[PDB]
Amino acid sequence: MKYFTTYLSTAPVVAVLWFTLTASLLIEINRFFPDIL
Amino acid sequence: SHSVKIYNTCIGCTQCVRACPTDVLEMVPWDGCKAGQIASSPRTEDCVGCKRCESACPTDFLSVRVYLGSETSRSMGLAY
Amino acid sequence: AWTVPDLADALKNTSAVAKAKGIATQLPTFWELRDALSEVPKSKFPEVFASYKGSTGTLLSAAEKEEKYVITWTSPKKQIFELPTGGAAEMEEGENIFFFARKEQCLALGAQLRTAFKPRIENFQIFRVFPNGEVQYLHPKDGVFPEKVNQGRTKANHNPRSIGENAEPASVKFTGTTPKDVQTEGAVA
Amino acid sequence: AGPARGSTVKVTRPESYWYNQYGKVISVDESGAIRYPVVVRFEKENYQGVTTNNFALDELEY
Amino acid sequence: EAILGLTPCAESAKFQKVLTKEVKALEKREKLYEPGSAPFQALEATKAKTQARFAKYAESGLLCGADGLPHLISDPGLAVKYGHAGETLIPTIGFLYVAGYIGTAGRTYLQEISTRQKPTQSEIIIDVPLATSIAFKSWDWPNKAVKELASGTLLEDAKNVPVSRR
Ligand code: CLA
Ligand code: CLA
Ligand code: CLA
Ligand SMILES: CC1=C(C#C/C(C)=C/C=C/C(C)=C/C=C/C=C(C)/C=C/C=C(C)/C=C/[C@@]23O[C@]2(C)C[C@@H](O)CC3(C)C)C(C)(C)C[C@H](O)C1
Ligand SMILES: CC1=C(/C=C/C(C)=C/C=C/C(C)=C/C=C/C=C(C)/C=C/C=C(C)/C=C/C2=C(C)CCCC2(C)C)C(C)(C)CCC1
Ligand SMILES: CC1=C(/C=C/C(C)=C/C=C/C(C)=C/C=C/C=C(C)/C=C/C=C(C)/C=C/C2=C(C)CCCC2(C)C)C(C)(C)CCC1
Ligand SMILES: CC1=C(/C=C/C(C)=C/C=C/C(C)=C\C=C\C=C(C)\C=C\C=C(C)\C=C\C2=C(C)CCCC2(C)C)C(C)(C)CCC1
Ligand code: SF4
Ligand code: SF4
């Protein structure tokens, strides 16, 4: 590892990671507090 | 026939002339640019309208311009 | 100096003309080939087949009734080139002649002659041939290739402005003119 | 007058891709026969994919 | 309070019909399994959640239609006067806060990298420290918005905006 973090900084990796976290957060909220209308 | 016109923004790079597949354009001498040549279109009865010249031109809004017009058997690219 | 060349001087070489007619003929109808094979024994079958030398990409009836095109050049060696009408042919050492049905096919072969051979061939001449027998020389029209500037050439269809300085169509209505052809220097037909 | 080599100009030629945009001057030609003497370079390429163009003095704001 | 011809879900018979219809389906599925088995437990969890959900909708002042399904009120005046602001009006404010935040973070990062040597390299390779800093400093985004607006630093002037031949 000397340029591996720069690879992780590229747009599709950062996108996959960000969506995964944002999705995970919404899933976990919809586990704890379901059926908000 | 199509009509090919050259405007005074030409810089005489010869790229349009090189691009043309039916020998319509040539370079003639001129004093309006550093290269001392402008493009010209003597043989527009042989122009097929491909617009390859306009793709080659590097000036901002092209100095060569092809206005499509009436069709002939030459302009329609027919081998029959 | 440079003078306008003649196709007649090129067409004197009867072998090169024979070859040109051979290659610019259409492939035969199945009926005709059947008859040709019918008149020979079996050993001579490839010779019959070897007698055809054309393709389906060659001249049709328009060439006879409207105009055909001829390209001539001289090669330093016998080499295989690619026809613009599909397939391959052999240029001979010495004079080559080839008939085509469009000017774009001629110049396509010309473009191949000037790029795809190690001694580059620069000496091709293209002519237009009418049915009556008039031959008009086309290219290179003044001896110099058109990408090179040559004295004696004049400006054709030059507009002495930029393209943004053209008029509006609504300003030349019912007058018989367009904005693009106003004040054009060297306006050809 | 001409702009200085290295100065910044604003294009005022309406048919240009870089109208109302700023470019760097690279070269000025001094002959009077030349119709578009100033060479300008821009950061944003146009649709053709080029980044440079010749201009006249009456098409620049410097 | 019944408005617009709607009944409250808490005192609607069609609401109960719907709950019955869902619970009955789950019972039918349970008939196939054995009362201790793990599929059975799954179907019980499903049924529990279902009854809980209907109970929640009942004590929320939701308003049912003739279909027996809850209906939302979107005029803010009607919503606030009859206690339905949680259906659309609060979510509005909630969406507009988060959308303003995302915009502000994005605009900020773009204005920051635009002063770099090759600004386009910082668009395909994200400057992750810079991006995290911007993401967390942008929680008070109306500060920046109202400042930019009132000062005049929000809009580019028309003379600097590329435009066509008009
Ligand atoms: C090997 C597989 C692979 C795949 C599938 C992709 C796919 C993509 N790359 Mg590429 N890329 C790759 C290899 C790959 N790349 C490599 C080896 C390099 C050299 C490092 C690049 C360099 C590169 C650059 C520089 C860029 C891309 C971009 C892109 C995106 C194109 C625009 C787009 O679709 O954005 C729309 C975005 C999406 C559709 C988001 C998808 C993200 C994940 C997959 C979804 C996860 C969300 C959730 C958990 C599940 C889905 C549910 C949801 C849809 C509701 C696309 C994600 C461009 C981009 O803009 O990406 C942001 C971009 O700038 N890539
Ligand atoms: C409407 C149908 C039709 C038309 C308009 C043409 C027209 C043409 N054919 Mg084609 N041809 C056809 C059907 C047709 N053909 C069929 C069905 C076959 C058999 C597959 C052929 C085999 C064929 C050959 C080998 C050649 C041509 C050639 C030509 C061209 C010159 C004239 C000729 O020599 O005919 C030639 C011969 C025929 C038309 C055969 C007639 C078929 C008879 C009536 C039997 C059909 C039924 C039979 C059970 C099928 C046997 C299949 C078996 C061989 C596997 C001309 C463009 C020539 C060409 O391409 O010049 C470059 C050429 O060399 N044709
Ligand atoms: C900084 C990011 C940003 C900001 C502040 C804006 C702001 C705006 N957009 Mg634009 N847009 C953006 C990115 C952005 N956009 C991107 C990435 C795309 C390509 C998909 C577009 C495509 C687009 C279109 C086609 C249109 C707009 C329009 C608009 C205007 C009205 C609101 C809207 O339509 O939202 C809609 C926004 C989208 C459809 C794109 C989603 C933007 C994402 C969710 C946020 C930015 C993502 C970015 C990667 C964040 C990285 C930040 C991080 C590194 C710190 C508003 C000025 C409209 C307009 O012109 O109004 C007059 C319009 O038609 N936008
Ligand atoms: C998402 C997001 C944001 C964020 C965020 C952040 C930082 C959130 C943090 C997330 C975090 C911190 C995620 C938790 C991990 C825990 C897991 C997965 C479970 C543990 C794993 C399990 C199940 C362990 C179980 C066991 O030990 C048991 C019981 C017995 C052992 O014999 C065996 C094992 C080991 C199996 C912003 C910044 C707020 C806004 C942005 O817009 C979007
Ligand atoms: C190769 C590559 C790539 C690719 C990628 C991809 C394609 C991906 C995908 C991805 C994906 C596809 C993702 C996914 C996600 C998911 C998620 C996000 C999930 C979550 C979940 C959860 C959170 C859950 C939980 C739960 C529940 C709910 C219940 C119970 C159990 C549990 C707890 C588990 C990229 C582009 C980077 C580029 C470079 C290379
Ligand atoms: C959950 C929830 C919430 C929240 C939410 C949010 C906050 C969201 C966000 C979201 C987001 C943030 C999203 C985004 C998205 C985006 C997209 C999806 C986009 C797309 C785009 C497109 C598609 C485009 C296209 C185009 C172009 C680019 C150009 C040309 C034209 C066109 C148009 C084609 C609330 C609070 C309300 C409440 C509760 C529930
Ligand atoms: C409230 C409400 C309502 C209504 C409303 C209305 C009626 C309104 C209107 C309105 C109008 C009639 C208008 C408006 C206008 C607007 C504008 C004009 C805007 C602007 C914006 C901007 C400018 C921007 C922004 C931004 C961005 C993009 C980025 C980030 C930052 C900022 C924020 C700056 C309803 C019922 C629906 C629902 C409930 C709520
Ligand atoms: S349109 Fe094609 S044939 Fe006509 S001048 Fe341009 S390049 Fe030559
Ligand atoms: S018209 Fe364009 S391509 Fe042709 S010589 Fe002039 S500048 Fe070069």
Swiss-Prot record, chain A:
Keyword annotations: Chloroplast, Membrane, Photosynthesis, Photosystem I, Plastid, Thylakoid, Transmembrane, Transmembrane helix
User: What is the superkingdom listed in this entry's lineage?
Assistant: Eukaryota
Q: Which stretches are transmembrane? A: 7-27
SUPFAM superfamilies attached here?
Subunit IX of photosystem I reaction centre, PsaJ (SSF81544)
Q: Please state where this protein is localized.
A: Plastid, Chloroplast thylakoid membrane
> Its GO biological process terms?
photosynthesis
Which family does the entry's similarity section mention? Belongs to the PsaJ family.
Purpose = May help in the organization of the PsaE and PsaF subunits.
Give the protein's recorded name.
Answer: Photosystem I reaction center subunit IX
Species of origin: Euglena gracilis
The organism's taxonomy opens as:
Eukaryota, Discoba, Euglenozoa, Euglenida, Spirocuta
Curated annotation (Swiss-Prot), chain B:
Keyword Transport recorded: yes
Residue intervals of the 4Fe-4S ferredoxin-type domain: 1-30, 36-67
InterPro entries listed in its UniProt record: 4Fe4S_Fe-S-bd, 4Fe4S_Fe_S_CS, PSI_iron-sulfur_center, PSI_PsaC
Gene3D superfamilies recorded: 3.30.70.20
* Residues involved in [4Fe-4S] cluster 2 binding: 20, 47, 50, 53
Q: Which GO terms describe its cellular component?
A: chloroplast thylakoid membrane; photosystem I
Q: Which residues bind [4Fe-4S] cluster 1?
A: 10, 13, 16, 57
State the reactions this protein catalyses.
Answer: reduced [plastocyanin] + hnu + oxidized [2Fe-2S]-[ferredoxin] = oxidized [plastocyanin] + reduced [2Fe-2S]-[ferredoxin]
The cofactors required by this protein are: [4Fe-4S] cluster
Q: Which E.C. number(s) belong to this protein? A: 1.97.1.12
Its subunit composition reads: The eukaryotic PSI reaction center is composed of at least 11 subunits.
The cross-references to PANTHER family, in alphabetical order and at most eight, read: PHOTOSYSTEM I IRON-SULFUR CENTER, PHOTOSYSTEM I IRON-SULFUR CENTER-RELATED
This protein is called what?
A: Photosystem I iron-sulfur center
Question: Which source organism does the UniProt entry give?
Answer: Euglena gracilis
